[PDB]
Every structure is written in C-alpha cells, then in structure tokens.
C-alpha cells in the first residue's frame, strides 16, 4: 500500500498534465 | 428462509484460510479501494449515461444518480458488515450460505452466475463503442458493429473480440499486481477528472433548463439504468486472503470506493448534460462525444484511451467473479465438479473459462446494451436485497459475533436498502422479468434434482 499510493498520484498528475496541455492547444 | 443448511462460519474460515495460506498478505485500505474503483468505473458511466439522459431522465439524470447512489450506499454498508463479520474470500453467495442457507444461497448463486455473465457481455458492448469511436478519426464493415436489428448490423465483432481476449488472458493467469492495478485505476480516474476539468469550461446552463422533461417517472426509470454503474464494490472481498487485518480494511475499501465514484458520477452527469443537449446524448461514447461536440478533439482521444484501458479492467473482474463463482458453487457440491491436469501428472479442479467465455462472447455480439444492462440490473438488485436482509438475519441469529464494522442504524438502514432497491426493480421492463424468472426456475429445478446431492447432504 505504501509505494502504490505514489504511483497512483504520479500517473494521475502525468495524465492531467498532458491533458491540460492538449486542451490548451485547441479551438 | 426455507430448507436451510447454513454453512458454519468456521468452515468458511478454513476454506478462505487454506486457499490463502500460501498467498502473501500485504494489501491495505488503499489497494482495496483501487480494487473497488477499478471494478466500478466502466461502461455504466462511460456509455449508459448517454442513453439514460437522452431517453429516460435528461438533465435530471443527476437526481437519478443520487437516488440510485443512495440505494447502493445503504446496500454497500450491508456488504461491509458482512466483509467485517465474515472476512472470507467470497461475496453474496458465501454470505447467504452462512446466514440463510443452501436454498437461498443456491438461488442467489444461480442468480449471480448469470448476473456476472450478462454484465460481462454488457461491459464489452460499451467497450466496443469506445474502441470503434476511437478508431474513426477507422471503421470496420457496417454489418459488424452492433447487435442484429432490422436495418444495419449483424454482430458486434469488437465486443466479441475483447471477450475472447480477456478469456485468453484469464486462461494464462498472469499474476495480478497490486501496483499495476493502481496505475490502470489512476488512468481511469484521471481521464474522468480530465473530462470534468476540460468540460466545465463549456457548460451552457441552457442545456439544463428542460430539467425534468420526462418528469420524476423518467428519473426513476433512469435510476434503474445507471444503477449498472455502481456495481463492483463487492469485488473488494476477492483479495480477502491477501489483506493484513481484513476485518477493517475491507469495509473501508468497499465504502470509500463507492462514495468516490458517487461524487464523480454526480459530477459527470451535470457536466455531460451541461455540454451536450440531452436529446443528442444517445450515442455509443457520450463522454468522448461530449468532447468532440464542443471542439475538444485532442482530449477526446485521451478519454477514449482511458476508457479502453479502464473498461477492460471491469471485464477482467466480472468474468473472474463468475469463474470463481463456479469454483465455489461446485466446491459446495451444488454443481458437478470438473477436473483438468495442471501438471503432466497432477490434476486439479477446473472450470472451463473458454466455454463460459464463449457464452459471454455470443451474447455480447448479438444483444443490445440496454437489454443486457437491464437483465444485469434485476440480478444485482435481488442479490442486493438478499444481503441487506441477511444482515438483519445475522443480527438476530448469531448476535454475539465479531463486528469491527457494523451498519450505522440497526434496522432502519438495511430496511431502507430493501425499499430503495425494490423500488428500482419496479421501474424495469416486464421482458426483463421473462429471462430472470425463467432462469431462476431452471436453477430451482436443478436444486431439486441435483442440489441435494452435495457436500452437506449427510
Ligand atoms: C483545474 C481545471 C478546472 C483548470 C485547468 C484545466 C485546463 C485544461 C483549462 C484551464 C484554462 C482553460 C482554457 C481557458 C479559456 C479557453 C477559451 C475558450 O475557447 C474555452 C477553451 C479555453 C482554451 C480553455 C481550455 C481548457 C483550459 C486550458
Ligand atoms: C465559436 C467559434 C468556434 C470555433 C471552433 C474552432 C474551429 C475548429 O477547428 O474546431 C475544432 C473542430 O470542432 C474539430 O476540428
Ligand atoms: C508493464 C506491464 C507489465 C505487465 C505484467 C503482467 C501484469 C498482469 C497482466 C495482465 C493483467 C490481467 C491479469 C489476469 C489474471 C488476474 C485475475 C484478475 O484480474 O482477477 C481480478 C482481481 O480481483 C483484480 O485483478
Ligand atoms: N457483477 C457485476 N454486475 N459487475 C458489473 C460491473 C459494471 C461496472 N460498474 C461498469 O459500469 O462498467
């Protein structure tokens, strides 16, 4: 449970970072 | 409860202890919450939200999620006390066998044999929608993209392929990883948050003004539809053998996973209907459709990929929960024991996953999603009602039991779980009763010609 909480928060931020990045370059 | 041969809880500990003696226990309340969220978020929120908004509730689908969410909360508390009182690697079948017994356990088990199966077909149909939508922009043959109607299609080939693929996966039996699970779940959670974060900038409250066009009658019929989306928190008890202190971390994993999905579900319904008018939401991929409809095409690819990699986890959990259900029912003697060799000279109990998978693959390619969801919903609702009553039965019979977690209010909450669920069953079509009652009559016949030929007859 220890290290898995970090891998969850990491790829969550990685996806939201790239998602926020693509949404800025549209419309 | 008639003809009750209750399984002693001591016997459930010995089986969950012998099967989980070699397994290393180290999972916590976070890993179990990932196991719940990874089994809840899927076709129900990604696909069924569109049809339910368009043809059932509209913008008032948020009230449909609140009524449906309230029913699952009351029922999840009952599942939680069972997981805290009987911390065995089993679900509503193993709970009903220890509280009611045999007859009620067999009916529910036979009911769940179908419910896990029809839900597996339903999850794959919605998976076929997002996979095809992600490809266009490409398209397979027009006659192999949906169920068989009057004009258009023959079979849903992508839904058939993904079932046989998961059947091929579960056959190999790659050792499931707790860290690999948290990654796939975080992919699902992030893209849902990605939709809400991006989609909130495009919400026009004019698309909310006809709030209840179908009235509360349509809010209720939609609640039985998106009730599909909340199923999955019962899968937390699967890893009961791999948890240190399961008496308290399993109730945490069940409730925390459900309440997290409930907030996300209430958020998605408001944003989805706020972006797209509810009339235009009848589509196979409403969340990706909402990002396309509003000119956010690049983000619609992310959500489509997270849905493809996320819904495919619900399918793995559903078909495993059906396969493990065949292992437990035949172990209790209510079904014939099948065997196959695991080594060149060592045979073990076997459940033909390629036949149970091929049956799921057939129905996923010929039955529309709204029917499979409704037939799944009547199976889950009766299983939910039985567990909610079983808590009160387990409170009256065997009161002096270890309960690390117990339902907040002793009679009121489990009764509310029964009334809320039973009210949702009334808003399902009558044809759903045809396949559900006739299925129970088939199982009721099996029990009275073979069910009393088991490991507890004596
Ligand atoms: C935490 C959340 C709510 C905020 C961060 C999400 C990102 C994806 C947001 C923050 C600012 C947003 C932008 C702000 C303004 C506009 C102009 C208009 O044409 C809508 C799209 C667009 C271009 C938005 C796209 C999405 C955007 C980049
Ligand atoms: C109002 C102005 C609307 C302008 C929309 C931008 C044009 C555009 O390319 O939008 C992406 C399109 O929806 C997919 O390609
Ligand atoms: C970087 C990738 C490395 C990958 C390395 C292999 C990882 C496991 C492989 C496939 C997942 C499917 C496993 C299927 C067997 C597990 C059964 C299952 O899913 O059971 C439900 C459980 O409760 C919850 O998973
Ligand atoms: N045992 C079941 N009926 N499982 C169905 C899981 C459905 C899941 N909540 C989804 O929306 O995809």
Residue numbers in the entry:
A (entry chain C): 1 to 27
B (entry chain A): 1 to 137, 141 to 461
What's written in the study?
Following an extensive screen of prokaryotic homologues with high (>40%) amino acid sequence identity to eukaryotic SLC7 transport proteins, we identified a suitable candidate from the thermophilic bacterium Geobacillus Kaustophilus, GkApcT. To address these questions, we determined the crystal structure of a close prokaryotic SLC7 homologue in complex with bound l-alanine and l-arginine ligands and studied its transport mechanism using in vitro biochemical assays. GkApcT was determined to be proton-coupled, with uptake of l-[3H]-Ala observed in the presence of a membrane potential, negative inside and a pH gradient, alkaline inside. Crystal structures of APC superfamily transporters have revealed a conserved ‘5 + 5 inverted topology’ fold, wherein the first five TM helices are related to the second five helices via a pseudo two-fold symmetry axis running parallel to the plane of the membrane.
In particular, Met321, Ala119, Val317 and Ile234 all adopt smaller side chains in the human proteins, being serine, glycine, serine and valine respectively. However, we discovered that Met321Ser was able to recognise and transport both l-Arg and l-Lys to a greater extent than the wild-type protein. Indeed, the affinity of this variant for arginine is significantly increased as demonstrated by a reduction in the IC50 value from 6 mm in the WT to 11.4 μm in the M321S variant. To further validate this result, we obtained a crystal structure at 3.13 Å of the Met321Ser variant with bound l-Arg. The structure shows that replacement of Met321 with serine does not affect the position of the helices within the protein, with a r.m.s.d. of 1.15 Å over 480 Cα atoms when compared to the WT structure. As expected, replacement of Met321 with serine substantially opens up the ligand binding site facilitating the increased size of the l-Arg ligand. The l-Arg is positioned with the α-carboxy and amino termini making identical interactions to those observed with l-Ala, with the side chain extending down into the space opened up by removal of the methionine. In our structure, the guanidinium group sits close to both Glu115 and Asp237. However, the overlay of AdiC and GkApcT suggests that the guanidinium group of arginine will be accommodated in a different position than observed in AdiC, due to TM3 being positioned further into the binding pocket, pushing the side chain towards the conserved serine in the mammalian proteins. The complexes with bound alanine and arginine reveal the molecular basis for amino acid selectivity is based on steric restrains rather than charge complementarity, providing insight into how the SLC7 family has evolved to select specific sub-sets of amino acids.
